[PDB]
Amino acid sequence: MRECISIHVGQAGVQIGNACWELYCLEHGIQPDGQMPSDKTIGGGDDSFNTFFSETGAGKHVPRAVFVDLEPTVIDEVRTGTYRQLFHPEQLITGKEDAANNYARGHYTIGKEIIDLVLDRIRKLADQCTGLQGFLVFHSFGGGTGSGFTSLLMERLSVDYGKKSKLEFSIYPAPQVSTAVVEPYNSILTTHTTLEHSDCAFMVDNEAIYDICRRNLDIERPTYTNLNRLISQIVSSITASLRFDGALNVDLTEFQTNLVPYPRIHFPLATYAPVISAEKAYHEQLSVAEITNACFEPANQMVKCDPRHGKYMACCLLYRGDVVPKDVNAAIATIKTKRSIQFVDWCPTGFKVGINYQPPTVVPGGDLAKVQRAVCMLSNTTAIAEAWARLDHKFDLMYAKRAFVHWYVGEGMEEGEFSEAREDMAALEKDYEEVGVDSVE
Amino acid sequence: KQSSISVAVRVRPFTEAESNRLVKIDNDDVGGLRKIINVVDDRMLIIASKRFVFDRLFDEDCTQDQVYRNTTQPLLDSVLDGYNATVFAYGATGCGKTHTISGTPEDPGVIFLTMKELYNRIEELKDTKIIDISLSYLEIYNETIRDLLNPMTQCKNLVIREDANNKISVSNLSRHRPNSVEEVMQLILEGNKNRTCSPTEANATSSRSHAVLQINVIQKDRTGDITEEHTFATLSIIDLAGSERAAATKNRGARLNEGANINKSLLALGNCINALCDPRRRNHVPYRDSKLTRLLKFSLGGNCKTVMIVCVSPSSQHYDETLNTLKYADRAKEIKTKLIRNLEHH
Amino acid sequence: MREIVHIQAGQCGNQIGAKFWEVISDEHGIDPTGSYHGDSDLQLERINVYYNEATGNKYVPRAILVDLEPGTMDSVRSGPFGQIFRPDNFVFGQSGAGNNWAKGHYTEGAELVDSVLDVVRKESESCDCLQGFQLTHSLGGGTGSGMGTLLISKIREEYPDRIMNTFSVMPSPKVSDTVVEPYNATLSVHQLVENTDETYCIDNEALYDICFRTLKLTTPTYGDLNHLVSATMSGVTTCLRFPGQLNADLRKLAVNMVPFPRLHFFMPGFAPLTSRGSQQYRALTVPELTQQMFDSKNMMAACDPRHGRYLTVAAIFRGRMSMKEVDEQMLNVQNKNSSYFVEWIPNNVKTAVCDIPPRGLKMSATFIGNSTAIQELFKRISEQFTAMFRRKAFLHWYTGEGMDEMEFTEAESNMNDLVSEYQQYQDAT
Ligand SMILES: CC(=O)O[C@H]1C(=O)[C@@]2(C)[C@H]([C@H](OC(=O)c3ccccc3)[C@]3(O)C[C@H](OC(=O)[C@H](O)[C@@H](NC(=O)c4ccccc4)c4ccccc4)C(C)=C1C3(C)C)[C@]1(OC(C)=O)CO[C@@H]1C[C@@H]2O
Ligand SMILES: Nc1nc2c(ncn2[C@@H]2O[C@H](COP(=O)(O)OP(=O)(O)OP(=O)(O)O)[C@@H](O)[C@H]2O)c(=O)[nH]1
Ligand SMILES: Nc1ncnc2c1ncn2[C@@H]1O[C@H](COP(=O)(O)OP(=O)(O)NP(=O)(O)O)[C@@H](O)[C@H]1O
Ligand SMILES: Nc1nc2c(ncn2[C@@H]2O[C@H](COP(=O)(O)OP(=O)(O)O)[C@@H](O)[C@H]2O)c(=O)[nH]1
Ligand SMILES: [Mg+2]
Ligand SMILES: [Mg+2]
């Protein structure tokens, strides 16, 4: 009854979804074949909950997911890999040619040839569910598909569904690190097109996770598998309130009424405190106060920003494991009196608390340690206004000389659409300066 | 010896479909949406939140005579007295660029009126000096030049070339020498008939190729003068295609390729105008990005002056590309040009 | 189902293509007979990109050979890998080009390109989805410089929205081989600038220097040069037929490397390259590979990068490696050498990674660059052209076949315009 559909777009989306569904299968006892021998231990078990999996009469558990990608290189690896029997064989491929880091091809030219299948599968999955609580769309700014196809699909879903929640998980471009020359253009066009369709778009930066892996986990040569595992842990911490039971369960629909004050400002940061390897799992207490303090440190942020250069607007702390409300209240009281962690003058409450009794899982062959308790912080703050501005500085430098523009106009776009995508973003920046000034009377 | 580039603006009247909704729905408050442009005077201009200045603007109720008298006289007078001058249209789909520059047999455009006045001036000056004319008419489509007067020639043979003097000259171009206004009307009508267009859409008058008409005027003495008064000159009328967004056309076939090439050519023209306007980008102006800007090498800033007629719409849906046209017009107004006399035979 | 159609024009193109198919067959595990004796499944999952399947588990290359003299075709047929090619695409004439661009583009090439286009259509219509074409030719001779350009123009007319590539062996600065190199080079560039999308410039002297200094080879034959070219030719598509963390196709590299349509001339390179007696004294890691790649001594074109600035650079890695290492190393290279990079492009590097390295190495990396220094090469021709055109040294052989001086003037003007275009962005801000 608490179900929610997941969609993944592009290479980044598919590779994050691999880790996400590996984690879900590990947590709920489902094997890669889709079976569930956990019923042997307890008769009539419900470990493979109906939130993320659909059960057939034969004992299988097919996942609720729609993997879509233009190029046939990542989905084929899933069809050949070890999870080939888990997913429904309707993993959608255009199978012809990639978007080539072009927003126009992902939106106008090639995206229009495959969107109908996506909508049909989403309709079937929605009709299977009794009442779905929202959509979880995984993508990444900078890629052609991740921008264009995500924007097109969100537009069509808002036309079709509307009031249903639509949350995002996006890999924002880093200020210095990058792997694409035309990435600022795609990011700017995406934020223009997908500002009035989403409801809460979480952001993640690759450079921040690299720094976290270097400092805490002590991995000097990480790859994308570790980043995907950390993002999987974030999403599992978010969704733990639906599958299991706890003292305070935060539903998906209650995220919005506690994190977004105004409709346009819906870009919060996400952080995971107890990132510790098995070697340093010892010599540490890992109490509620310690993890709560670690969540607010600049060094443990998963998005490259300095919260000290801005004011926190809202915070939502989702705990897991052995946690008592008194310890959480003590941690919040300790945090509030600190003068470095500022808050807006129009939010005396500030924090939302959620507690769940299921501890975090551990994937074999990973690097995260087994911890009794964990916490995930989702914070809406004004530091993000810096991260936009840098990207805007990368836009105006290139658009001034009209560089890399002939591809976009040659694949069905007008130059003016660029300028709008700047101006709207500028307005958003102004909003983040209009909601930081202290009130007067 | 230098001249000044010229810019003018025109706006169409509401169509029947939008005007009907305007009278029904939005008239009560005062889709038939509100008037964004709201022209404030003859020279300046206002938009929803800003203000600009262009030369000799026109309202939706303006007449052909007013625009002809306000844009063409310097070009006509210069071209007849040697020199060089041109005119070219700009804007987006549905802004009426093919109506003002060409017109209909009952609503004639700038071409008919300016060439008829040239013929009348030739008749008037016949007692003084003899004048002859030559004509050519071509289109640019999908990065290919096509001749609208000799369609049998293939696009393979049509190619632009230049010598050490850097003078543009098209090969195998059909240069036609007329004798009367009826003949040139026949040529113009046949060329417009053979123009590439999209009759699939409801607006079958939609042009999907850049049309270029070139008229050369030459002079010669009457009675007994010995190798005097040659004084050739060139004039060109250019009709560009629109920059319709792909969002406005869900169905996409060969029209996709046509629109892509049209937008690439328009972007090349915009880059050329921006390069010319900027002081320190004068080291090189990218004329070679498309055939269109290559053919207008001398027209832009080489040895000639031109009139940029930008066409807009009053519908509220048409906002962003109208602003793009306004910005590009502003920089097109800031480019200079030189002007020199013609060769004399001896 | 992305696939590529290969064409080979002239002696240089034919030899490079022969070595290229020799390399690719070993990469995918195919014999001279055309059967399969690989070991891994990944070699057959994307075999359709280059090869075409046949009856008895056989595989025929999708290559089209063309040259006006039959000697090179007989040499290739007598070679070891001559049987895999289908006999029906061995299109040839009888009268050679004679190192004359007019004979290859106007007189004799026109009498043979129809068959080539028929073969190209036959190969292309069998495709489920076509990514683009790729051609190998030399810009000094007559067959290459004429027929390759004519075929490129006609294919672009028939297939406008597909990628066209060229691996052109540009004329040498010092040691030439034909007296009429400048005319052929200028007339071929006049078409390449208009038609192609990725022109990979290569120079013989750079290959000789690489062979003498890096590889420490005493007697580098043409086979070694063809090997060096084939290494890069089989690296710009590794992500298009193997899995990887961050994939990349020909169009993705085209978009991230061509800021303006006329700037599509690229300098390639390959790493690791070491002597056979010095591989036990080196640690094969990402920093060593990037140091070897970005060094001017490893470039495959004579033009020095340090005489200009990089507009856009691309790096295709092959093997298992950390993305943090790659990102950190490219950022460090950009920061340290900021004088050699363009300001108005914030990030100049486009990285791609593939998980399957070559047969006998644990790591490899193909470098591509778009440098303003390439203008120098054109400038050299623009001198060697005019010194011969100001006196009409060897011009009657060209006018006797149909051409006129207008073509020569137009080609010179286009080359000078390209040089000025590069010089504009070299010193802009
Ligand atoms: C133990 C070891 O490292 O063996 C190497 C080797 O010793 C060195 C010296 C090899 C060797 O290469 C040369 O000596 C050479 C000669 C002329 C031109 C170019 C190279 C090698 O011949 C080259 C050969 O390379 C390959 O097999 C690659 O897969 C290559 N394919 C072919 O060379 C090939 C040629 C004919 C038929 C089938 C395959 C390749 C490269 C790029 C992309 C695809 C394939 C290998 C493993 C070696 C030897 C054998 C000594 C080097 O070559 C390459 C391309 O890897 C030169 O320095 C590199 C790396 C090594 O240090
Ligand atoms: N966190 C994370 N980010 C990734 C991963 N793979 C790619 N990215 C990011 O994605 C960005 C570029 O988009 P890609 O994922 O490579 O490809 P895409 O988004 O699907 O766009 P296309 O090229 O059209 O397919 C890069 O800047 C990467 O930072 C991944 O496995 N994990
Ligand atoms: N000022 C005007 N008054 C009345 N009717 C007009 C006016 N301008 C244009 N029209 C008519 O409106 C219709 C659409 O304009 P049209 O001239 O087709 O624009 P266009 O420039 O041809 N579009 P494009 O094909 O993209 O260039 C035409 O049939 C015109 O005759
Ligand atoms: N790399 C390489 N280059 C070659 C080879 N043979 C010739 N060339 C180059 O190609 C040029 C001659 O072109 P050629 O192949 O004779 O053209 P064609 O006669 O018209 O087919 C010379 O400048 C050489 O540098 C070869 O085997 N390998
Ligand atoms: Mg991709
Ligand atoms: Mg028109």
Numbering used by the authors:
A (entry chain A): 1 to 441
B (entry chain K): 22 to 51, 100 to 116, 142 to 440
C (entry chain B): 1 to 429
Text of the article:
To understand the mechanistic basis for the dual-functionality of kinesin-8, we obtained seven cryo-EM structures of Candida albicans Kip3 bound to either the microtubule lattice or curved microtubule end mimics, and a microtubule-unbound CaKip3 X-ray structure. Our findings implicate loop-2 as a tubulin protofilament shape sensor that regulates conformational changes in the kinesin-8 motor domain, which can either induce curvature of protofilaments at the microtubule end, leading to microtubule depolymerization, or enable forward displacement of the neck linker for processive motility if the motor domain is bound to protofilaments in the microtubule lattice.
To investigate this hypothesis experimentally, we designed and expressed a mutant version of the CaKip3-MDN construct, whose long loop-2 was replaced with the short loop-2 sequence found in human kinesin-1, HsKIF5B (CaKip3-MDNL2-HsKHC), which does not contact α-tubulin in any of the available microtubule-bound or tubulin-bound kinesin-1 structures. In line with our hypothesis, the cryo-EM structure of this CaKip3 construct bound to microtubules has a docked neck-linker and closed nucleotide pocket in the ATP-like state (MT-CaKip3-MDNL2-HsKHC-ANP), unlike the CaKip3-MDN construct with a full loop-2 (MT-CaKip3-MDN-ANP). These data show that the kinesin-8-specific elongated loop-2 acts as a tubulin tether on the microtubule lattice pre-ATP hydrolysis, preventing the motor from closing, and that removing the CaKip3 loop-2 residues that interact with the microtubule lattice enable the motor domain to form the closed conformation in the ATP-bound state. The MT-CaKip3-MDNL2-HsKHC-ANP structure also suggests that loop-2 of kinesin-8 is directly involved in inducing tubulin curvature because the tubulin conformational changes in this structure are less extensive than in the MT-CaKip3-MDC-AAF structure (compare blue arrows on α-tubulin). While many of these interactions likely contribute to the bending of tubulin, loop-2 adds to the tubulin-curving ability of the motor. This is supported by the greater degree of α-tubulin displacement relative to β-tubulin between the MT-CaKip3-MDC-ANP and MT-CaKip3-MDC-AAF complexes than between the MT-CaKip3-MDNL2-HsKHC-APO and MT-CaKip3-MDNL2-HsKHC-ANP complexes. The data from the ATPase experiments show that CaKip3-MDNL2-HsKHC is ~1.6-fold faster at hydrolyzing ATP on microtubules than CaKip3-MDN.
